[PDB]
Symmetry: D2
C-alpha cells in the first residue's frame, strides 16, 4: 500500500548521478519508470543495473528512450515522444528533470555568445517544452507533479561557473511561473549541494581529493551528499500533494558556513 505503486514516473536525466538514484528510489516504491538520456550505452547499463537491483519488478516497468535534448531542431519532438512513451495508454504521474551537460564552461576571457546560449537549450528550452506538451499526457491535478533541478551555487556560486549559476536561478524562477501556468499541477525544484557523482569526478580530475575535503569541511554534516539521500527530495515532492512553488534544498548546511 504505497502511494507511488501504480504511478508512472518520467526521469529526464536518469541514466547517471542524481536522476539515476531517483529511478532507483521510485522503483523501490513500485513505480513504473521511464528513463531519458543521450548516451545509448549509459541508457543500456542504467536499465540493466536497475533490473539487477529489482529482479522482482516486471521489466516492462523499466523502459528507456534515447533523446539528445541539446539540439534545437529535435528537442521538441524528442520531448513529445518521450512523453508519449512514458504515458502508454494511461497518463504520466510525475516528471523529474535533472538533465544537464555539466562540463566546465570557459573562463570570462574566452566567453563567447554561444557558450552562454548553448546551455539554455537543455536547461531552459527542454523544461518549457515539457510544460508545453505535458497536458496531453498528464492530468492537471494536485496529485501530479513536475520537478526541476537547481543547485546551491545559485546562492553561493562557484568560481568560473557564473553562467551555470545564472541558469540555476532561471530554473528556480521558471518553476514558479510554471506552477501558475500549469496549475493545479504542482511544480517544484530541488537545489542540491555537493553530490559526488561520476560527472563531478570527471570535471575535477586530479583536484577531486582536494575539492572533496573542502566540501566536507564547509558543511555542517561534514559530508558530501549521496545520490540516494538527495533522491529523497524528489520522492518527497511526488508524495506531498500540497507542495508547489517551492525549492527543496539538500546541501548539508553548506549555506551556513
Amino acid at each position: 500500500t504505497d502511494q507511488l505503486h501504480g504511478s508512472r514516473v518520467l526521469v529526464i536525466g536518469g541514466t547517471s548521478g542524481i536522476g539515476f538514484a531517483v529511478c532507483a528510489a521510485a522503483l523501490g516504491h513500485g513505480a513504473i519508470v521511464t528513463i531519458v538520456g543521450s548516451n545509448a550505452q549509459k541508457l543500456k547499463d542504467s536499465v540493466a543495473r536497475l533490473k539487477s537491483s529489482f529482479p522482482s519488478t516486471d521489466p516492462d516497468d523499466i523502459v528507456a528512450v534515447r533523446c539528445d535534448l541539446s539540439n534545437s531542431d529535435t528537442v521538441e519532438q524528442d520531448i513529445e515522444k518521450a512523453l508519449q512513451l512514458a504515458a502508454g495508454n494511461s497518463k504520466i504521474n510525475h516528471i523529474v528533470i535533472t538533465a544537464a551537460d555539466m562540463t566546465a564552461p570557459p573562463p570570462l576571457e574566452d566567453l563567447t555568445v554561444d557558450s552562454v546560449q548553448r546551455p539554455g537549450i537543455i536547461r531552459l528550452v527542454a523544461p518549457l517544452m515539457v510544460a508545453k506538451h505535458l497536458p496531453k499526457y498528464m492530468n492537471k491535478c494536485p496529485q501530479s507533479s513536475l520537478t526541476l533541478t537547481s543547485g546551491a551555487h545559485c546562492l553561493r556560486p562557484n568560481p568560473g561557473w557564473t553562467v551555470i549559476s545564472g541558469y540555476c536561478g532561471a530554473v528556480e524562477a521558471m518553476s514558479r511561473g510554471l506552477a501558475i501556468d500549469l496549475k493545479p499541477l504542482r511544480v517544484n525544484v530541488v537545489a542540491p549541494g555537493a553530490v559526488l557523482t561520476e560527472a563531478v569526478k570527471d570535471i575535477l580530475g586530479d583536484a577531486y581529493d582536494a575539492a572533496v575535503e573542502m566540501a566536507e569541511a564547509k558543511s555542517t554534516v561534514g559530508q558530501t551528499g549521496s545520490p540516494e539521500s538527495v533522491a529523497q527530495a524528489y520522492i518527497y515532492l511526488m508524495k506531498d500533494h500540497y507542495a508547489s512553488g517551492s525549492v527543496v534544498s539538500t546541501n548539508g548546511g553548506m549555506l551556513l558556513v
Copy 2:
C-alpha cells in the same frame, strides 16, 4: 530494510493535527514514537487511535507524556523528562516540534508586553531547551535530525498576526543557528501553509467557512493541505541525511498568487 524501522522518534506536539499525522506516518515506517502534549486526555485518545490503526506494532512503542511547555517554571524539566523517556535504554534518532499555543492574538492597539513574550516560551524557549539537553540523549550524527515548525505567514503575514509571524521568523533563523551549534546533527524547518486541523476551526469559530474558501482560492492547487500530506515533509527530513539548515515549504503555491 527501512532506516526508520528501529528508530526512536519524539514528536513534541503530536496529540493533534500535523504532529499526530507525523506519528502515524512514522509508525507506518515501523518507528518507535513518543508523543508530548499538555492535554491529559487528548494524550490517551491520540495513543489509543494509533494503536488501533497499527495493531501490528507492540503497544510499548507508542508512549505519551504530559507537559505544559507554555510555563517557564517547568519547561526545562518537562523537556528533559520527555527526552529521557523517548530515549529509553537507547538514544533518540529524530525529534519533531509542532507545539504551539494556537490562540488568536490581540490587535495591535491592545498590544501588551505579556502578549509578546508569553508565546516565546513554547515557541523559543522549548526548542532551545531541547537543543540544550538533547546531546545527552542523542548522537550528534547526520543520521539524526531535529525539525522545528514555521509557516508561510513568515513571508505572507496574516493581519493582525504580526507577533506570530515574528516568532515563525525566529524559528527559521534559530534553526540555522542550531544547525551550527549541534553539528553534525541535522536541524531543519517545515513551513506549512493552510492546514485544516481541528485546532484551526476552534481559532476561527464561525468564520471558518469563509476562511477556508479564501485559502483554497489563494493557492495554485485549489485546495487546502491535508495533515497527512504535510506530514511527509517531516518524514523527508528524517530520511535525507544531507538536509540541514533548510526550510521545507509546503503551502499549495499560496506564495505565488
Copy 3:
C-alpha cells in the same frame, strides 16, 4: 530639491555606531533628528558631536532623550515619550530603530529561560510598542517610513549567537507584518554585515584583531563595513516611496564567500 530637508527623523539607538551615522547622514540632508539611548553621558556627547559637525543647523533640531528600552515596566511609556517629543506640533516622517543590548549570550549548556526572553524586550517589544503608538504621531502615508535592523547572521549565524540570530529572524518577519498592519505607511529592514563599531570591540575584547581580518578576508569587498556606508541603506529607505516589506542587505559579499 531635497525631500528630507523639512523632515523629522527619530533614530532609536542613535548615540553610537550605525544609528549615530544615520543621524549624521540625515542631518547632512538638513533633517530634524531626535535621538534615543540609555546612557546619559553618551547622549550629550552624541549631540555635541553633531552640532559641531553641523553648526549652521539650529541646535534645537538635534534633540536627545534617554530611555531604557530593555526595561519591561517602562518600555511603552518611554516609547510614547520619545514619539511625542519627535512629533512636536507636527508629525514624525521617519523612524529608524538600531537599539540593541549587544552583550555576548551564554553558551547553550548554561542557557537560561531569562537569557532567551530578556533580549526580546528591546528587540521585539520596543518596535511593537512603536508600531502601537506611532499612528498618533505619524501620518500613515507612503512618504513616511519605519525601518528596523537585522543582520546577515540571520542567514549565516555566528556561534554561539543562536538566540540573537533568532531575534534577527523575528525582526525580519515582524517588519513584513507591520508593513501590512500600518499600510500605507512603509516598513523595511536593514541587514548589515560586519561593521566595526566601538561596541563590537567591547564584545570581543582582546579577540578583536583576529576576527576583523577574518571578517575582511571572508567578504568580496575584502573590507569591513564603515558606519558611513551602511547608513546609506537607511537613507535610501527614507527616500524611496515605493519600498515596503523589504530587506536591504549591506554585507560586503559576506554571504558570497
Copy 4:
C-alpha cells in the same frame, strides 16, 4: 561636495523608463553620464530633455551612444565601444543595466525555441560581455559598482510571462557570480515591482486603466511605483561601498498580499 560629483556613470538602457530616471538622478548629483539605447531618435530626445532640466550642466557631461545589443553579431563589440566612450580619459565608476525589449512573449501554446533564447542576448549575454571587458575601463575596487535589473515577477510570476521570470532569476543569480568574478568590484541587482513607464503603457494598451487599479490594489502602499522612486535604489547602490551580492527590492509591498 557630493560623492557622485565628477563620477562617470554608464546607463545601458537609459533612453526611457527606469534607466532614464537613473540618468536624471545621477545628473542631479553632478555625475558624468553615458546613455545607451538602440533607438536613434530616443537617444537624441533623452539628452535634450536632460539638458533642459539641467541647463547649468556641461553638455560634455551628457554623452549618448546608439547600440542594438539584441544581436549577437555586434553585442560584444558595441559593449566594448560603449565602455570606451563612458571611460573617456578616465575610468568608469558605475554601470547600470536596465536594457530589455519589454514585448509580451508568446503564450505557451506557440512557444518556440527562438522565443526562449532571443531575450537572453540582451538580458544575459550583454551583462556578461560588460563584465568581460569592464576591467580595462574600470578599477576593480569597492567604490565602483555594477548594477543589474531583475523584477518582482521572479517571485510572483505574471501569467504568460514565465520565460521573462526565468531571465530575471538568472540575472539575480548571475549578479552573485559576478560579485565573485569581479571582486572586489561590487555587483548588485534592483528588483522593481510595478512601474508605470511608457513601455508598460504600450504592452497594456486598452487594459491600462484596469491593470493600474489591480496593481494599486495588490500593494501595501496603494500605489504604483514612481520611476523617480525606483531610481533611488540604483543611486543607493552607487553610494554604499559595502553593498555587494545583494538585491534591492522596490515593489510597494506587493509580495505581501
